Design a binder for this molecule. Structure first.
Ligand SMILES: *O=P([O])([O])OP([O])(=O)O[C][C]1O[C](N2[C]=[N+]([C])C3=C2N=C([N])[N]C3=O)[C]([O])[C]1[O]
Ligand SMILES: *OP(=O)(O)OP(=O)(O)OC[C@H]1O[C@@H](n2c[n+](C)c3c(=O)[nH]c(N)nc32)[C@H](O)[C@@H]1O
Ligand SMILES: *OP(=O)(O)OP(=O)(O)OC[C@H]1O[C@@H](n2c[n+](C)c3c(=O)[nH]c(N)nc32)[C@H](O)[C@@H]1O
Ligand SMILES: [Mg+2]
Ligand SMILES: [Mg+2]
Ligand SMILES: [Mg+2]
Ligand SMILES: [Mg+2]
Ligand SMILES: [Zn+2]
Ligand SMILES: [Zn+2]
Lengths: 647, 648, 223, 222
RNA sequence: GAAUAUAAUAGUGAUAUUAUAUUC
RNA sequence: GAAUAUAAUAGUGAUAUUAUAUUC
RNA sequence: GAAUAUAAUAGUGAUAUUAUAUUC
RNA sequence: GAAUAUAAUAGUGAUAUUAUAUUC
């Protein structure tokens, strides 16, 4: 083995005495070793005639694989059978038998949730020690919090069995919407109540050792103003008012370009447009479809304005060109040809402006400055760059590759499902420990306190730096308050460590009883009338609510050979074997040049069936006639006829 | 059991004597009982230490089912096991054990062919009796003759195995293209050679009994005058420039409204797809335009023909349906242009389809006939035969679209009711309702079909009208009526021969044909290892490469790689069949814009879900030279054919 | 192919859930189509890597031939090999081979009894569904009861072989020498135990449909 | 991962279902051959059936290595990979661990003991067996014992569905043979020991194999 | 030839007799 | 999807086109 | 396909829209 | 502790001794 650091022993200590401990320590100080310590001690604690059963909850699959590997190779030599159950290997298997025949089990929490609800696992008394990776997640309706709901429901009751010790691991417990230390302490106590925790473990005695292991990178604030003059926006504005005029040639207008309020307004406008009714129901299709294409088009224009605001004009122009070309590759329409022909008119001027040197972004200029300087002082620099969207990932990557100034940069991509600089959208929690970046750069990217603290893990080496480039003061302040909330966090934790076990446990039990009472006191009318499901783009008859069958009380399919004529299929670009289903292809509308995303086509059990989403269908009651729109399927209450194999 | 006819015993007598014989009896005199009698005698002739094994050959599934049920219901009581194997129940089952563990096996011939070729069934020595239903099909490359090729190849060889007795069943052996009796004689001898028959059994000493059961319907010939042009001087110019705006693109070196015009448009269309162009981008535009133009032209031709044979209203509704489907398959500038030109002149029409002034005299003659025959007998059951499947519901809508024929209840028979409209039934087939009236609307086939059609009305008083506006049809029927005489006379002449002499003439012909077939084998392909690019035929978009194409069971062709998966779209198959070890899951079309040209189908082969394509939907470009060649069949396209391997 | 009565679906419902079921319905309601539905659904329920094997038990030869005919005509199209073995075609034939190589097998019960006793058929595990026509004969030592004796003797013993679902078809289970209610009930329970049944399917919801298809004839007594 | 060609050439006979003795120089990469064979074998069964692979390693380091690889590789595709060694074998239900998993890595002595104890009915529960260092399959070695069970069930009256056998080695040996024919018969005896019908060797991709694994020059000092 | 079931008739019954039907 | 047959048409023919039907 | 979380924006908020990420 | 393999040395060999290594 290897000699463990003293602060790791210090963090493991509260948990090794058998207390439900939330361990809060810096990202990358070696929490895995602590986990192995606590687990080893826990399993060694039991006498003859009984062997403990530990379970480790990991949120993401990489963490699942990592921890499963480490735990296996570490503990198998000591005679402890280690297993793991992920989403893939959790179907058609006796999960109960797998749990009982193993000492250590690495799980994703959704599995245990579904197993508890299904009843395959009776209670959590089977376990002796539950560990929560990224514990702080155990709030709201997170799977962690569901497991803990079962735990507390079993605890808070006369019929109580032997419950397992609950250990939590995190780098930040968070403080929520707190503005002062008291509210923060309240939030932290609520979290400890969520985990039935009585002790918060932080490094106190061996602080300096930890300060020589993990380092806090110096953070810098880069406030640059917007682009001075935008000819691009001056063109796209006019195009969008021409599109707005094309759309206003039909209906009433009941806002600023390049804004988010506009992006919401166009959504509500489109949603309101696909409700429009006509006795013809033929020209209605043309009007609604046009009022879909217009909306979507000027929406793409808005997106292009945002991209233009956060990157090169060439990036936005390439976004528009990409969009219109993908529209051109997928059939054609009179409206589509119209708008396109309108766009290519302004295209030449647009690239006359885009290929102009004076039309450069200062926000990218300062980034180029920081990159040039930091790579000049140290040409062995490993950079990471966080941005909001994927469009900005591609744009910044092409900007890096297409810049004489930055010919020393070999960019890489880290987008949700070697090099010098990685370009990523966001990473949930800490995740699998990646290569060390001595330069973190936040490009219009600011999250909460927990994410801020976790981000320090990227550069836990001495001399690491973290810049924050923005053209919005609200961003700067939003990052400023996070540090104050971290202060409030550590101070609240430090005051909470002064309390004695009795008082804290009493408070915890009190709170637990409180939201248990909230949950229990919390806990419908299906109109069996038939309704036509129409295409949200064509207003054409897709199906009927009677033909719709519901699988697993979550998924929805259509019955009859009548529906098979209404859609078309294209082999799924990203197939997946989720639950008891297997994605085979995507399903779109079939009426003329439409092809609107209706749903997918999957293999389920012994049937090849089409599954739809109500987010792309209009519900029309035949009697009343009025049309309505629904997002979640659960909002659409009706006679949900269950699925039967005899049809 | 049931008391049989005497002519049945007479027909079954040469077969029961153990001689390979062809039975020629009028349609519907009960050949089933003959089969049952022959089988019963053949099975119960054997001793105790030996057992017989009979195999029956039905060409189609209805006959398969019927014969299987009858044989099983009749022979089980006698202690014989009867089974059947068709294409549906042929997969994943040991057919040799099914054959061995049974006494009577009803088969579709393709099953036995495939099993013999594969090797699951060693030889035909297993059977002691083979019976061919509609044995007139024993010729050319038909599965029957494919079986008899095996039979003879074993017979005409040093390898000697106990070969089964061969019985044939038909109402006509045919005469081929014989101009005289001595040629028809040679044809019949050739057929008997193909079936290794030494006897031709017909009714003779009991004809007086037979002719009181099967009555020959009287055959009236109705020659009518043609239409005299409310739909001719309208679509004429339409065709004229719909050809010439295709000529606007390029010059291309023949009366309109005919079949020759169809062939012309077809070959032209198959000559436009190979227009190599350096621009490539607008090559797609040109080809996708010309394809649409020709596709409109030929269906215009179809409308013209339909008008020439039926109502003009249906000739309109045809085009209306066509443009409806075109508008439903996505709107194109060219398509909406031709559609605009069509609907511009559509106002002139429809009104023309609404005048009684221009009504097809053929349909009026048909109305006259039907009204007459249903006046004389209201309980008349009429069956009608048309050339194409287009004229079926055309004549149907003509019937109910007429108050004069309000006493008619049309029925359909293609792929309760007074009249049944149909295309063309293969052979005798499963027996349907007995008809008192048979009408042939421009429908004349071979002599065998003529003789077999008499089975539709084998009762007394049955009639058959041949309604046509062409003399060639009439003469084509008369030559058949002469061919029947030639056949019967040749048969009666052969029945005077000595059995031995006939046997050696048969043997002679057999050896001749065997030598021919043996020497017919040839060095056919030198596989081109050069990688060829397969493009679409309509929009000329790149479909795939020859390196990606795999061949399955030396017949079908799939595409590997994830590259091709982004080249096509799919919609659930209209008629989901199940052929071989496959299963039609859906259809497969192009993806380049709304081209939507049919490429093939998407099937479920074992544990794979794969695309299967037909070469007649693609253009074979050469990646090296650029010579765009076309192939109508996969076997005509010789290239480096790599057998499908699950390893991939 | 078409228009099944709703009471037929109601009767086939418990058997389409794998439950061993005795079906009790008036004579002439159409038990054949019920058998066809149950059997069909039983066949289409198996995945690709697995297959089913249904066996029908007819007590008489005419019923045998009729059922074999119907099942053959109906399931040939779908791709199921249907065969039959009676006393006339039972000698000098490989019953193991005939049973395996077919998906649906129609038998007279004495055949199965004899071939089980001989050892030619090892166990009933080869079957996935057994249907009994006139299942009220499952008593004393009628061939049905012997077959079920083998079934039970494999069930209750140490043998853990996968036993097939059991369906019975009758218009009257009988009461025997019962003189009151809970005697008749005990008799019926004894019969259900003889057939390993746990569900007795009868018409309850679609009575109004059935009573318009099958009429009870008025009875008279002339002394 | 970017595979080599000779690996595919070595795996191909095994993927066709034939029992195969793969003989290739040490260091060529038999691991990816194992992974490929296992992947193709498991992802070939229909829905109504499932595959069960068993991997035999004679040493604990090789055992934990292979277990690590197979677990980190087949978890994604949806196959439960587990391992049994001398440490964990005691006081555990073996047949349950075997049936509840798709890929089972173990030392041969384990399976021998559980076959002798009768806790496992037969090898029919497996569909693919893979002997690492299959040259050990001789004499009283555990490999040859397992194969003795296999052959006893094979040549016996019983007709249970037997798993296909893949062996992995760099040498098969020739024993105390003097000429090529005795060596041939000994090799045939080894093939009979593993019920193999094909000996996989690199042929059409030697130019690459030599580019990968080189042969060291030898010197003799007397 | 044998087996099986239903019914009537005597015995408390094991059953026996006859009738009827089915099966191998 | 593939194979086979029949009919018409172009052709000296091997063939080709279309129509129709069947089978695997 | 569905569920969960984070952030921005509208709203008093329960919520809603968008973006992002994850899970089954 | 037990089982197993490789090598050398004895011997006709089954085997034996020893060395080395592995596994349970
Ligand atoms: O088309 P398949 O490959 O699935 O095979 P099949 O049996 O239908 O062959 C029939 C031929 O006719 C054409 N076809 C097929 N479908 C489904 C249609 C058509 N033609 C029209 N006008 N409408 C159809 O729906 C094919 O070319 C095929 O070769
Ligand atoms: O599309 P599915 O119904 O199979 O579900 P999903 O898990 O794959 O989620 C995709 C959903 O997000 C939207 N979406 C964005 N982008 C860029 C894509 C894409 O490239 N391909 C697909 N199929 N969907 C995309 C969709 O709205 C979808 O619902
Ligand atoms: O016993 P068998 O070998 O004779 O065969 P079987 O089953 O057909 O006969 C059964 C018994 O019935 C008797 N029996 C024959 N006949 C013609 C009659 C009859 O007409 N009426 C009665 N009441 N019995 C008959 C046979 O003698 C045989 O014992
Ligand atoms: Mg085929
Ligand atoms: Mg006997
Ligand atoms: Mg789900
Ligand atoms: Mg021991
Ligand atoms: Zn639509
Ligand atoms: Zn195309």
């Amino acid at each position: 083995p290897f000699k463990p650091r003293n602060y790791q022993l210090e963090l493991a200590l509260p948990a090794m005495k058998g207390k439900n401990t939330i361990i809060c320590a810096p990202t990358g100080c070696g929490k895995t070793f602590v986990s192995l310590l606590i687990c080893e001690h826990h399993l060694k604690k039991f006498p003859q005639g009984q062997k403990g059963k530990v379970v480790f909850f990991a949120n993401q699959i990489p963490v699942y694989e990592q921890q499963k590997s480490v735990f296996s190779k570490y503990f198998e030599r000591h005679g402890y059978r280690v297993t793991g159950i992920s989403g893939a290997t959790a179907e058609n298997v006796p999960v109960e038998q797998i749990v009982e025949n193993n000492d250590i089990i690495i799980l994703t929490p959704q599995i245990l949730v579904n197993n508890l609800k299904k009843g395959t696992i009776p209670s959590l008394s089977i376990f002796t020690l539950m560990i929560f990776d990224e514990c702080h997640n155990t709030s709201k309706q997170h799977p962690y919090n569901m497991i803990m709901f079962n735990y507390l429901d079993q605890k808070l009751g006369g019929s109580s069995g032997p419950l397992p010790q609950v250990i939590g691991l995190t780098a930040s417990v968070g403080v929520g919407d707190a503005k002062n230390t008291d509210e923060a302490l309240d939030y932290i106590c609520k979290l400890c109540a969520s985990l039935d925790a009585s002790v918060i473990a932080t490094v106190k005695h061996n602080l300096e050792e930890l300060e020589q292991v993990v380092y806090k990178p110096q953070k810098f604030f880069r406030k640059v103003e917007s682009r001075i003059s935008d000819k691009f926006k001056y063109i796209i504005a006019q195009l969008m008012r021409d599109t707005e005029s094309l759309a206003k040639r039909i209906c009433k207008d009941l806002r600023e370009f390049g804004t988010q309020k506009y992006e919401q307004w166009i959504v509500t406008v489109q949603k309101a447009c696909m409700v429009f009714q006509m006795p013809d129901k033929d020209e209605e299709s043309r009007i609604c479809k046009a009022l879909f294409l217009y909306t979507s088009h000027l929406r793409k224009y808005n997106d292009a304005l945002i991209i233009s605001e956060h990157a090169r004009m060439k990036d936005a122009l390439d976004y528009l060109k990409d969009f219109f070309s993908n529209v051109r590759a997928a059939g054609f329409d009179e409206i589509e040809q119209d708008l396109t022909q309108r766009f290519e008119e302004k295209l030449q001027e647009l690239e006359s402006v885009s290929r102009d040197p004076s039309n450069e972004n200062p926000k990218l200029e300062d980034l180029c400055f920081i990159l040039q300087e930091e790579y000049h002082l140290n040409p062995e620099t490993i950079t990471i760059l966080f941005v909001k969207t994927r469009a900005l990932v591609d744009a910044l990557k092409n900007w890096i590759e297409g810049n004489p100034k930055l010919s020393f940069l070999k960019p890489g991509i880290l987008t949700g499902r070697d090099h010098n600089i990685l370009i990523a959208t966001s990473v949930a929690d800490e995740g699998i420990d990646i290569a060390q970046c001595n330069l973190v750069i936040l490009y219009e990217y600011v999250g909460n306190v927990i994410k801020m603290i976790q981000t320090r893990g990227r550069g836990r080496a001495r001399g690491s730096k973290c810049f924050l480039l923005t053209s919005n003061a609200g961003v700067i302040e939003k990052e400023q308050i996070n540090m104050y909330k971290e202060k409030m966090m550590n101070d609240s934790i430090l005051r909470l460590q002064t309390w004695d076990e009795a008082v804290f446990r009493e408070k915890i039990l009190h709170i637990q009883t409180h939201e248990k009472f909230i949950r229990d006191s919390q806990e419908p009318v299906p109109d069996k009338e038939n309704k036509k499901l129409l295409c949200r783009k064509c207003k054409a008859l897709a199906c009927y609510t009677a033909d719709v069958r519901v699988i697993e009380e979550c998924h929805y399919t259509v019955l009859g050979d009548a529906f098979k004529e209404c859609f078309v299929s294209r082999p799924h670009p990203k197939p997946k074997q989720f639950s008891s289903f297997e994605k085979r292809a995507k399903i779109f509308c079939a009426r003329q040049n439409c092809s609107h995303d209706w749903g997918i086509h999957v293999k389920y059990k012994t049937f090849e069936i089409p599954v739809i989403k109500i987010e792309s269908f209009v519900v029309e009651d035949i009697a009343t006639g009025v049309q309505t729109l629904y997002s979640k399927w659960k909002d659409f209450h009706f006679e949900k006829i269950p699925f039967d194999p005899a049809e």
